[PDB]
Amino acid sequence: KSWMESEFRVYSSANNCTFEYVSQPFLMDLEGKQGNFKNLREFVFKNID
Amino acid sequence: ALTQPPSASGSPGQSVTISCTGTSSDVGGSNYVSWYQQHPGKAPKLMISEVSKRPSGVPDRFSGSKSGNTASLTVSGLQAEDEADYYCSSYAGSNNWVFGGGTKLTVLGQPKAAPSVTLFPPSSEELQANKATLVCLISDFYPGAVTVAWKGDSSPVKAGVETTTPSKQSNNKYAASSYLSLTPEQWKSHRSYSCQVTHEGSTVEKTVAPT
Amino acid sequence: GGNYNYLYRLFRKSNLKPFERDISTEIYQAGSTPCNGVEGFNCYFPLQS
Ligand SMILES: *[C@@H]1O[C@H](CO)[C@@H](O)[C@H](O)[C@H]1NC(C)=O
Ligand SMILES: *[C@@H]1O[C@H](CO)[C@@H](O)[C@H](O)[C@H]1NC(C)=O
């Protein structure tokens, strides 16, 4: 009785890393709902200096 | 290689052109095309840099241009002394660095001459010597852009022939020679051979038949 | 005899923005014809010691 995280297919290699951060562990839900959109998340990304 | 016609000449105080007509990906696909000059005995001297540029010296009669896969040089005014070879050159793709073929550039102040041709078949002692050589001599043909072709009874041949580069005589015209190697059984195989020489479009040929 | 552990970039297409870092070692093309990742005619390794 479970939805589980199986694949992570993003990159092949990662050679010369400069910055790295990893948050504290948690566990999301991953369960597929069937209602209406219940969550809005908004982000602003800027890149200066 | 690249292509340039091996003979071009004109009157002193005029404009002569020389075409380099390379392919793409060395001359058409680039811009680093140069022109050199070699007097008979010296090192080459850089005469024209990229496309149309000059070093110091180099009096402004020489000019260059490029119109696609054909770059060209033009001398505007033969003083007396710009007889040279004028190799064109290009940078090809992978550091290749190709070259040209070389064009003699004379200035016959007078009237062109006729290449006197003379042909000799293999002597008798050579026939007894189990070998055979045809001898084609060319002489007195002012402007030196001669070329030669050899003929068996009806067909051209391209094996066993050696051709001297033209050499200047005392009268300041040229002379040349070519040799044809044959086994005597091939000498009597074909009923006759000939040496033809072409010179400024014109052509003269001589012919000899075995006995 | 020299210490060659310290390097600097000598060639780039444009100036850096402030506070960025360029650790790429792609071969700088000084000419009009490309060179496909070999050093040679008008193509230089962009880092010197
Ligand atoms: C990145 O990787 C390449 C090849 O593995 C290496 O030459 C280079 O030194 C690395 N970068 C740094 C900052 O060490
Ligand atoms: C950012 O990357 C682009 C790649 O298209 C490059 O053209 C540009 O010069 C880079 N930024 C700077 C400041 O050079």
Side-chain angles (χ1 to χ4, degrees):
Chain A
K1 309 190 274 276
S2 288
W3 304 65
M4 299 240 275
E5 174 90 8
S6 80
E7 352 207 290
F8 174 88
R9 309 195 153 180
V10 188
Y11 53 84
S12 325
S13 358
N15 262 70
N16 278 317
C17 214
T18 306
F19 176 85
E20 180 170 348
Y21 166 80
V22 184
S23 83
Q24 333 238 357
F26 53 82
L27 191 70
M28 279 206 339
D29 226 56
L30 309 167
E31 199 203 70
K33 319 296 190 180
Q34 275 300 177
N36 352 74
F37 294 151
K38 287 287 197 304
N39 288 123
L40 173 74
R41 304 185 174 104
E42 314 177 72
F43 295 97
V44 161
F45 303 128
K46 289 197 291 174
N47 185 40
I48 350 123
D49 321 3
Chain B
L2 303 185
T3 304
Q4 34 182 345
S7 42
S9 283
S11 292
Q14 216 263 332
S15 279
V16 191
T17 79
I18 290 173
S19 42
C20 185
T21 172
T23 170
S24 170
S25 87
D26 42 5
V27 188
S30 316
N31 222 37
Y32 313 116
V33 183
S34 61
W35 296 83
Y36 298 88
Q37 149 160 340
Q38 181 168 199
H39 275 270
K42 272 85 188 168
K45 158 174 184 181
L46 170 64
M47 199 57 51
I48 287 93
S49 174
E50 28 184 9
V51 190
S52 316
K53 273 173 206 176
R54 273 102 49 81
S56 189
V58 54
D60 193 358
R61 294 174 283 119
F62 309 100
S63 43
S65 92
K66 185 187 73 175
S67 64
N69 298 277
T70 300
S72 90
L73 214 64
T74 292
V75 191
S76 70
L78 287 94
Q79 303 297 316
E81 70 276 0
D82 298 6
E83 313 159 320
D85 280 10
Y86 299 117
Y87 295 89
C88 61
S89 173
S90 156
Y91 160 71
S94 69
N95 324 5
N96 281 162
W97 265 118
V98 72
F99 272 154
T103 78
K104 275 185 185 184
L105 190 138
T106 43
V107 58
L108 33 104
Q110 320 145 286
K112 283 73 153 324
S116 146
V117 181
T118 300
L119 193 163
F120 276 73
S123 337
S124 49
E125 289 91 346
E126 183 185 15
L127 310 193
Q128 308 140 8
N130 316 0
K131 267 320 289 194
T133 326
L134 263 297
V135 177
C136 185
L137 310 84
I138 305 164
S139 171
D140 325 304
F141 51 101
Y142 212 48
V146 52
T147 162
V148 173
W150 282 85
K151 157 261 152 181
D153 304 322
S154 34
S155 33
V157 202
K158 309 75 161 152
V161 280
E162 308 70 19
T163 50
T164 322
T165 43
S167 144
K168 195 211 58 181
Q169 319 167 179
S170 101
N171 49 12
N172 288 245
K173 61 210 327 207
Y174 293 139
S177 147
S178 313
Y179 288 79
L180 163 57
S181 80
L182 321 93
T183 163
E185 63 85 60
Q186 251 173 316
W187 164 239
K188 211 42 180 209
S189 144
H190 277 64
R191 196 35 200 111
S192 174
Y193 300 100
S194 87
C195 177
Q196 74 88 73
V197 318
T198 99
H199 176 19
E200 313 326 285
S202 184
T203 299
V204 298
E205 171 261 21
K206 263 242 198 168
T207 300
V208 168
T211 38
Chain C
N3 171 36
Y4 305 96
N5 298 152
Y6 292 116
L7 281 79
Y8 59 94
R9 188 173 299 271
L10 188 55
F11 288 117
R12 220 166 158 274
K13 292 179 178 293
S14 21
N15 295 321
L16 280 172
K17 289 293 217 308
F19 276 144
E20 303 170 336
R21 192 195 286 103
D22 194 11
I23 62 158
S24 110
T25 60
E26 309 300 317
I27 299 190
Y28 174 74
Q29 178 191 329
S32 25
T33 79
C35 55
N36 319 124
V38 299
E39 316 172 326
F41 190 80
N42 286 335
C43 285
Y44 318 99
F45 195 63
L47 305 187
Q48 299 309 121
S49 168

